[PDB]
Design a protein around this nucleic acid. Structure first.
Length: 260
RNA sequence: UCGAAGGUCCUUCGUUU
RNA sequence: UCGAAGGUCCUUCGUUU
């Protein structure tokens, strides 16, 4: 069985021009990170011209490039990749797609699978490690247990602490809000707080980067969602880093282009 | 994100002697 | 006339910190 291994090139050719960025938000170039995604096929791919996807950070050019050709490796490895492809499309999102990393040539990511398979308290308190949350996706443990919500860590607010003033009038402090509503007590009252961002699955080929009722309401919801400030002790860190996650959310748009 | 309700129209069927 | 089952779209609301 002949195999063909493609890499999905992501390079930011047109960053926000810095006139267009009024708010001077951080830019997240895809080329700054070595971990990417590839497509695995049986029959090769009919050459596709390179195309843009429009993200918050700018115009990102997608190039489908052939990294390796003609090989094949076992069956169990062929079967394992499928579990990652599912994981990407079922658990992360909602012929084969797999993670790659640098060795200056590219191979299948060795550190991907065991973060997840690494994931199978307390009286002495939660400890805040700044390097944990640097590139991170966090989920709140205290709500939405069915389908947990996930956020990028946008900022670490260092002057803020769980005893800082809660933004809404009904509560004095974050400590109080979480105690009152969720019955949660914090073991660490000196920890900073986290700013978040969220995007997930939409179409990136055009630039939203006449609304109905159901959509005008999600506009407000998404808006408030991004203004949320979260508590690190009350949040779990997702194994897949935010940097790889940002590449992952372009996959539906990119795979759409290859089909059409 | 997950839900709730009101309305509107369409499809399929029941209902009379 | 009164109903059943399924769907479409519009509108209103809850849900986050």
């Amino acid at each position: 069985q002949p195999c063909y291994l493609y890499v999905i090139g992501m390079v930011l050719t047109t960053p926000l021009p810095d006139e267009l960025n009024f708010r001077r938000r951080k830019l997240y170039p895809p080329e700054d990170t070595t971990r990417c995604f590839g497509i695995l096929t049986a029959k090769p791919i009919p050459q596709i011209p390179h195309f843009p996807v429009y993200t918050r950070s700018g115009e990102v050019t997608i190039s489908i490039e052939l990294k390796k050709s003609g090989f094949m490796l076992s069956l169990q490895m062929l079967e394992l990749i499928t579990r990652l492809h599912q994981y990407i499309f079922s658990h992360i999102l909602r012929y084969c797609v797999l993670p790659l990393n640098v060795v200056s040539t590219l191979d299948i990511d060795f550190k991907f699978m065991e973060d997840i398979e690494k994931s199978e308290t307390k009286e002495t308190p939660f400890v805040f490690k700044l390097e944990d949350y640097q590139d991170a996706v966090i989920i709140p443990r205290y709500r939405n247990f069915d389908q947990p919500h996930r956020f990028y860590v946008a900022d670490v607010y260092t002057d803020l602490t769980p005893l800082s003033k809660f933004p809404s009038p009904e509560y004095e402090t974050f400590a109080e809000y979480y105690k009152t509503k969720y019955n949660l007590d914090l073991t660490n009252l000196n920890q900073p707080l986290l700013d978040v961002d969220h995007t997930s699955s939409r179409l990136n080929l055009l630039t939203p980067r006449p609304l109905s009722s159901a959509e005008k309401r999600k506009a407000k919801w998404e808006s408030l969602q991004n203004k949320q400030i979260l508590v690190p002790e009350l949040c779990a860190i997702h194994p897949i880093p935010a940097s790889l996650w940002r590449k992952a959310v372009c996959l539906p748009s990119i795979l759409y282009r290859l089909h059409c």
